[PDB]
Write a protein that holds these residues in place. Structure first.
Motif, short mmCIF file in Angstrom:
data_model
loop_
_atom_site.label_atom_id
_atom_site.label_comp_id
_atom_site.label_asym_id
_atom_site.label_seq_id
_atom_site.Cartn_x
_atom_site.Cartn_y
_atom_site.Cartn_z
N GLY A 1 -6.53 -24.02 -31.54
CA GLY A 1 -5.60 -23.31 -30.96
C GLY A 1 -6.15 -22.37 -29.53
N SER A 2 -5.76 -21.09 -30.53
CA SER A 2 -6.30 -19.96 -30.18
C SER A 2 -7.07 -19.66 -29.27
CB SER A 2 -6.25 -19.24 -30.87
OG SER A 2 -5.53 -19.26 -32.50
N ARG A 3 -7.87 -20.68 -29.24
CA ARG A 3 -8.96 -20.03 -28.11
C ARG A 3 -8.50 -20.63 -26.53
NH1 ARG A 3 -11.71 -19.04 -24.54
NH2 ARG A 3 -13.71 -19.40 -23.90
N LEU B 1 -2.36 -35.39 -38.35
CA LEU B 1 -0.97 -35.70 -39.88
C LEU B 1 -1.71 -33.81 -39.54
CD1 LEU B 1 -0.86 -38.31 -42.04
CD2 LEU B 1 0.69 -36.80 -40.59
N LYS B 2 -1.10 -32.56 -39.80
CA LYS B 2 -1.58 -31.56 -40.43
C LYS B 2 -0.76 -30.35 -41.92
CE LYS B 2 -1.69 -28.94 -36.19
NZ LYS B 2 -1.63 -28.64 -34.93
N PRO B 3 -1.86 -31.70 -42.62
CA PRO B 3 -1.12 -30.80 -44.09
C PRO B 3 -1.40 -29.31 -44.48
CG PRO B 3 -3.20 -32.06 -44.07
CD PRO B 3 -2.65 -31.85 -42.82
N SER C 1 -8.90 -24.01 -37.43
CA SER C 1 -8.41 -22.53 -37.69
C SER C 1 -9.08 -22.06 -38.11
CB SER C 1 -7.34 -22.47 -38.97
OG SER C 1 -8.02 -22.68 -40.20
N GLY C 2 -9.59 -21.49 -37.06
CA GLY C 2 -10.32 -19.94 -36.52
C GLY C 2 -11.91 -20.23 -35.55
N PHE C 3 -11.98 -21.24 -35.25
CA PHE C 3 -12.92 -21.11 -33.87
C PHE C 3 -12.33 -21.08 -32.61
CE2 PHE C 3 -13.51 -25.24 -37.55
CZ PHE C 3 -14.27 -23.98 -38.23
C1 LIG Z 1 0.91 -19.76 -29.85
C2 LIG Z 1 0.66 -20.86 -30.54
C3 LIG Z 1 1.67 -22.48 -31.08
C4 LIG Z 1 1.57 -23.62 -32.40
N1 LIG Z 1 1.79 -24.37 -32.44
C5 LIG Z 1 2.41 -25.10 -32.94
C6 LIG Z 1 2.93 -26.43 -33.19
O1 LIG Z 1 3.72 -25.99 -31.92
N2 LIG Z 1 2.92 -27.79 -34.28
C7 LIG Z 1 1.66 -27.29 -34.72
O2 LIG Z 1 1.78 -28.13 -35.73
N3 LIG Z 1 0.95 -25.97 -34.75
C8 LIG Z 1 1.46 -25.30 -34.02
N4 LIG Z 1 -0.51 -24.38 -34.06
C9 LIG Z 1 -0.67 -24.30 -34.42
C10 LIG Z 1 -2.50 -24.60 -34.30
O3 LIG Z 1 -1.51 -25.81 -33.53
C11 LIG Z 1 -3.48 -25.02 -34.57
O4 LIG Z 1 -3.30 -25.10 -36.02
C12 LIG Z 1 -4.18 -22.70 -34.77
O5 LIG Z 1 -3.73 -22.68 -33.81
C13 LIG Z 1 -5.51 -23.44 -34.94
O6 LIG Z 1 -6.04 -22.06 -35.33
P1 LIG Z 1 -6.58 -20.84 -34.18
O7 LIG Z 1 -4.91 -20.61 -33.50
O8 LIG Z 1 -6.99 -20.10 -35.30
O9 LIG Z 1 -7.58 -21.75 -33.47
C14 LIG Z 1 0.24 -23.78 -32.75
C15 LIG Z 1 -0.78 -22.06 -32.63
C16 LIG Z 1 -0.81 -21.00 -31.42
C17 LIG Z 1 -1.76 -19.79 -31.50
#
Ligand SMILES: Cc1cc2nc3c(=O)[nH]c(=O)nc-3n(C[C@H](O)[C@H](O)[C@H](O)COP(=O)(O)O)c2cc1C
Lengths: 163, 830, 182
Positions: free
Chosen positions: B798-800, B701-703, B765-767
């Motif tokens: 995510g982004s890393r 879950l992603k609240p 989210s950030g790391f």
């Molecule tokens: C290219 C990309 C696609 C993403 N796609 C989804 C998705 O389909 N569903 C979702 O819940 N979150 C998505 N996210 C959010 C990521 O799951 C995550 O919360 C986020 O990338 C983490 O933060 P960071 O990018 O700072 O590491 C996405 C993020 C990025 C950068």
């Protein structure tokens, strides 16, 4: 008259109005519980215990939320159910103001007969009784039925159903 | 030979086998008690009417004890010892009246009014039949203290805990008039002698201070002004703190020396510091009424000389109507500023003090928490401060959710204090010398050798014993000159803390709890009886309860969520957290990214490197489309290797095909480990379907916001056995993001999350490295904001990973991702 | 303190829900036997092949995750008796189940390590044409390097073994399945 589950904005309003010892007009819903209580936190924390005894789950810090935003949040997981606290609050309202002997069943069938108001109206009707509690015990039975007429007329005015 | 006597009220009955030799007097008592017994009501929810048979025996006990003489042993002592013994052999299966009155309130339709009537009636009846609590009650707390498991400190409340202190003093005199009767008349005779002795007192006290009169008759009780005026407010808070302390010690059956000896230390807030030294010195019940006379004489002389120093001042009706129109409270020289930093409040004070001369300045008097400050000055210069503060405060009916966190207007509750003197203000400084002269003239001095257990100063937090100067000089100087640092004084280590202060449920106990929650300090609110619904702080019942459920401590998050190391047979080293234990791979996941985790290569190339990755629902449009991708994953990965599925919660059409698709792939034993719902949180009914039908191992879950976290916890409640991975993501994340700061929502919710052990709280989210994650793995990240360490189970990146070799991202997009410099948290909102 | 020796060691790291000494034991299965306390008591306390075998709720077939047969078989019903011999070293530990066969108590399920990296839930039928009990060697790989599902059933010739059992039960010939169906 059509039967609906009791509105959880009226229930909350009656709780806060009866809890502070105020009438229904004095306290609007566009006001947080912290604002209306003022200083006293002794009231606040056991109002938050009373709301948790009615609906169960509460939002994070329901202290600084308007009673529209709080009532609306209760609609998500509420369905007509008086529960524990409001059922005991109506049990200590009748046994203090209604003449010794007056039962809830009497009033209920009386509301069913005279007004045609079913159980989903009678929950909200009894909430209007508590919130505007009479001063002393209405020993006269007629006085208890003349109060039950005036409060069923506040219920019919607030809801917007002709009676 | 015995003869049965029933006492009944409608449906509820109790049978008591009264001796036939004195039975004909128990039916004389039974008729007259059943006359006192009202008319029966359905539910028994009427007040002054028993609900239980237990509360009917306790109402009979109190009716018979009301007529017994404690000198002239009349006939009704030989009928109390047979109905109080049956009380002990019907209801009291070991435990006190208080731990079973806690059973009544939560289980039966029992109220706090008739529970405190049952407590009074039993306590009057036990001490009325000449049966004082002399035995050593083996409370699981004290057992643990003896064994060394538990450590106790006794905190003591100051001013402003409640609107009306006097109501706690009336409730003590109501429930415990049999035990306190000695302290009240002694204090009434000490003060009413001082008044005729000390000059000007008679002027200070107009309606007088013969407290005995106003406690026998509540009707004559003056307003909470003559009472609120500190020459009367102080001494009566001195009295009530000892009155709790003595009532505890009596009930237990310990000397004030024994209860004192048990405690690791003792401390007070503002003018409660005198009570702490008054109980630290005491040794015996005889050597108590010298600690009482000292305490009362000190509080009297502070009160009198501080009211003669900076007096109460009449106030224009024009200021008073405006102050109560904004619900800022009735103006007084003490103002509480909830939910703001110290520096902020000092800034605003400096801004108000700019327009004022030295004699009318306002100054930060207290710091009663992380964000709970009190300021002091002239009421007019405090109003002048309040005018500036209401110009910062946001409207209470505002939704800021759609506004960036840095652009949001700070939300906080400033209020005035129920008090009539600026404590810890320079305004009273000319009283310090006069107080000290009036103490030495009556010969009141606390000797450092007499104090037995350590007692912690309000200002600096040091022990008062090691003081070079006068102890009675330091206490005064702490009360009227020095600003209390409550987060500095409460730096002692303990397992429990005892709140004997006035206020109880809104007492100093709960304040210190919220200041210290998650350091494993099960604080006890010893000044009131009630049940804590969430059960994070105790009350009066677990002081005495002689069970195994007496010792039930609070959690110490740094300890049980300390990340460990563990090793398998192969000599592979794993980080052990609540999360990695379940999945059996490092607690590092790659969350479903559209389109980075759409590719069935990047899902298999991440799984074959021994890590947990979600397949992105977002990229697929039909049950067939995903099914091909899944199968391609299943063909590429090794045997027994797993992966999960990420379904967005704003695409109802996707969910509509998706949820079946997983359900039937689980039915065919497809290696689908978990489902991560992104961009919102399902309802309790939708989540209850997803958890009980799709036969997963845990539900991601992603609240979005705090409210979302609230819902996530509610699903974790509904299904306690099933693991939930709360994947919390700040606004500073990549892709579909919220407006929230990553930290603050955790600093609010982290306690409430950790209460449900099934929730693997996964931060992210950030790391993009081990270094910046390390503070959040350990729990030290939360030390910076002045919280206890609050360690997380695992991470998500995510982004890393988007520039990894097996990600399908075009080679020119990778040069564009790389080229991006990025920014520290603080700057992200730009 | 930078000493890898200090680090605890187990068999396989995983499959531990976040909500949570005897060598020769004998467990009688009652009607009102708690299934979880039973399976824990079979698994014992030490995390070995046998512990995986009775507490993992999913086993691996090829790449597919099916419901754990070891738990399904050992599900407590009245008349079952389980013994655990040599239950202090895993390597030697055996788990024999006996049940009421034609009234009398007979051995049914011999669960043991056939090798250090191979389980064998030797299944036995007593109700035979000749009387000698027929034996089915259901093999499984215990790989502790996969901490989630460390039990993968040996799919190589699983049908060959099962048939070879049913041959001995039904057919009164020498076992041979390499003939033309046509
Ligand atoms: C290219 C990309 C696609 C993403 N796609 C989804 C998705 O389909 N569903 C979702 O819940 N979150 C998505 N996210 C959010 C990521 O799951 C995550 O919360 C986020 O990338 C983490 O933060 P960071 O990018 O700072 O590491 C996405 C993020 C990025 C950068």
């Amino acid at each position: 008259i059509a039967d609906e589950p009791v509105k959880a904005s009226l229930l909350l309003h009656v709780l806060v109005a009866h809890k502070l010892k105020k009438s229904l007009d004095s306290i609007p819903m566009s006001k947080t519980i912290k604002d209306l209580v003022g200083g006293k936190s002794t009231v606040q924390n056991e109002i938050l215990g009373d709301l948790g005894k009615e609906f169960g789950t509460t939002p994070e810090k329901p202290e600084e939320t308007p009673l529209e935003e709080l009532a609306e949040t209760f609609q998500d997981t509420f369905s007509g159910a008086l529960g524990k606290q409001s059922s005991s609050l109506l049990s200590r309202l009748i046994s203090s103001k209604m003449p010794g002997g007056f039962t809830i069943t009497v009033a209920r069938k009386y509301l069913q007969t005279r007004w045609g108001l079913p159980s989903g109206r009678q929950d909200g009707v009894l909430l209007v009784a508590l919130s505007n509690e009479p001063a002393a015990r209405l020993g006269s039975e007629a006085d208890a039925k003349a109060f039950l007429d005036s409060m069923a007329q506040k219920y019919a005015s607030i809801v917007g159903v002709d009676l | 030979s015995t003869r049965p006597l029933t006492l009944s009220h409608g449906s509820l009955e109790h049978v008591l086998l009264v001796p036939t030799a004195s039975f004909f007097i128990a039916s004389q008592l039974q008729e007259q008690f059943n006359k006192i017994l009202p008319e029966p009501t359905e539910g028994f929810a009427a007040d002054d009417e028993p609900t239980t048979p237990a509360e009917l025996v306790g109402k009979f006990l109190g009716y018979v004890s009301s007529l017994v003489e404690p000198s002239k042993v009349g006939q009704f002592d030989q009928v109390l010892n047979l109905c109080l013994t049956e009380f002990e052999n019907c209801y009291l299966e070991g435990n006190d009246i208080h731990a079973l009155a806690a059973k009544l309130l939560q289980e039966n339709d029992t109220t706090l009014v008739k529970t405190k009537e049952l407590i009074k009636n039993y306590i009057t009846a036990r001490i009325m039949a000449k049966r004082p609590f002399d035995k050593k009650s083996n409370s699981a707390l004290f057992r643990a203290v003896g064994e060394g498991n538990a450590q106790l400190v006794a905190i003591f409340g100051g001013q402003g805990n409640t609107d009306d202190y006097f109501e706690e003093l009336r409730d003590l005199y109501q429930t415990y008039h049999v035990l306190v009767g000695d302290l009240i008349k002694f204090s009434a005779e000490t003060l009413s002698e001082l008044i005729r002795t000390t000059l000007d007192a008679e002027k200070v006290f107009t309606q007088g201070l013969n407290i005995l009169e106003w406690l026998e008759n509540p009707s004559n009780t003056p307003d909470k002004d003559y009472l609120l005026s500190i020459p009367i407010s102080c001494p009566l808070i001195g009295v009530i703190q000892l009155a709790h302390y003595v009532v505890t010690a009596k009930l237990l059956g310990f000397t004030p020396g024994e209860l004192r000896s048990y405690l690791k230390g003792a401390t007070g807030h503002s003018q409660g510091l005198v009570t702490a030294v008054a109980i630290a010195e005491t040794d015996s019940w005889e050597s108590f009424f010298v600690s009482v006379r000292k305490a009362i004489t000190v509080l009297f002389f502070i009160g009198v000389r501080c009211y003669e120093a900076y007096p109460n001042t009449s106030l224009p009706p024009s200021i008073l109507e405006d102050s109560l129109e904004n619900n800022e409270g009735v103006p007084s020289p003490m103002l509480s500023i909830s939910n703001l930093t110290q520096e902020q409040v000092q800034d605003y004070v400096n801004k108000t003090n700019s327009h004022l001369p030295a004699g009318k300045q306002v100054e930060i008097s207290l710091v009663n928490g992380a964000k709970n400050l009190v300021v002091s000055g002239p009421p007019q210069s405090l109003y002048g401060l309040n005018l500036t503060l209401r110009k910062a405060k946001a409207p209470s009916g505002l939704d800021q959710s759609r506004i960036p966190f840095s652009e949001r207007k700070l939300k906080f509750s400033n209020r005035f204090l129920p008090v009539a003197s600026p404590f810890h203000s320079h305004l009273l400084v000319p009283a310090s010398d006069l107080i000290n002269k009036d103490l030495v003239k009556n010969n009141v001095s606390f000797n450092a050798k007499d104090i037995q257990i350590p007692v912690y100063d309000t200002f600096d937090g040091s022990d008062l014993r090691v003081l070079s100067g006068s102890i009675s000089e330091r206490i005064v100087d702490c009360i009227i000159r020095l600003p209390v640092k409550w987060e500095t004084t409460t730096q002692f280590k303990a397992t429990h803390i005892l709140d004997f202060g006035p206020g109880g449920a809104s007492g100093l106990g709960v304040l210190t709890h919220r200041n210290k929650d998650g350091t494993g300090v099960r604080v006890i609110v010893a000044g009131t009886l009630d049940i804590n619904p969430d059960d994070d702080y105790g009350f009066k019942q677990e002081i005495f309860d002689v069970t195994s459920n007496g010792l039930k401590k609070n959690p110490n998050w740094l300890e049980e969520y300390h990340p460990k190391l563990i090793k398998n047979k192969s000599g592979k080293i794993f980080v052990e957290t609540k999360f990695s234990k379940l999945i059996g791979r490092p607690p590092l996941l790659v969350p479903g990214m559209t389109p980075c985790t759409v590719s069935p290569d990047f899902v298999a190339a991440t799984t074959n490197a021994g890590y947990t990755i979600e397949l992105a629902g977002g990229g697929y449009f039909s049950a067939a489309g995903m099914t091909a991708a899944i199968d391609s994953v299943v063909s590429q990965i090794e045997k027994g290797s797993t992966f999960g599925i990420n379904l967005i919660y704003v695409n109802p059409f996707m969910l509509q095909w998706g949820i079946p698709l997983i359900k039937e792939l689980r039915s065919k034993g497809y290696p689908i480990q978990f489902l991560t719902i992104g961009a919102g949180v399902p309802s309790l009914e939708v989540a209850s379907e997803y958890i009980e039908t799709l036969g997963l191992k845990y539900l991601g879950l992603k609240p979005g916001s705090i409210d979302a976290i609230s819902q996530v916890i509610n699903i974790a409640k509904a299904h306690p056995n099933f693991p939930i991975a709360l994947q919390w993501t700040g606004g500073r994340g990549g892709g579909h993001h919220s407006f929230e700061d990553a930290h603050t929502p955790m600093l609010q919710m982290y306690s409430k999350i950790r209460r449900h052990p099934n929730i693997m709280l996964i931060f992210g989210s950030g790391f993009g490295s081990a270094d910046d994650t390390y503070p959040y793995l350990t729990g030290e990240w939360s030390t910076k904001f002045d919280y206890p360490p609050m360690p997380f189970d695992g991470f998500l990146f995510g982004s890393r990973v988007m520039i990894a070799k097996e990600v399908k991202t075009s080679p020119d997009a990778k040069k564009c991702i790389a080229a991006c410099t990025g920014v520290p948290d603080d700057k992200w909102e730009q | 303190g930078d000493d890898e020796s200090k680090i605890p060691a187990v068999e396989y790291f995983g499959g531990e829900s976040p909500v949570d000494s005897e060598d020769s034991a004998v467990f009688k299965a009652t009607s009102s036997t708690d299934e979880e306390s039973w399976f824990k008591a079979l698994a014992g306390s030490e995390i070995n092949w046998r512990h995986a075998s009775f507490l993992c709720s999913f086993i691996t077939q090829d790449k597919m995750f099916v419901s754990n047969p070891i738990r399904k078989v050992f599900k407590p019903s009245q008349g079952m008796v389980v013994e655990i011999s040599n239950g202090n070293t895993s390597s030697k530990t055996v788990v024999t189940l006996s049940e009421p066969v034609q009234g009398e108590l007979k051995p049914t399920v011999i669960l043991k390590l056939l090798k250090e990296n191979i389980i064998q839930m030797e299944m036995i039928e007593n109700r035979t044409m000749d009387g000698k009990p027929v034996s089915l060697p259901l093999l499984y790989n215990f790989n502790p390097d996969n901490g989630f599902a460390p039990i993968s059933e040996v799919m190589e010739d699983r049908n060959q073994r099962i048939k070879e059992m049913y041959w001995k039960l039904w057919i009164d010939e020498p076992f041979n399945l390499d003939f033309d169906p046509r």
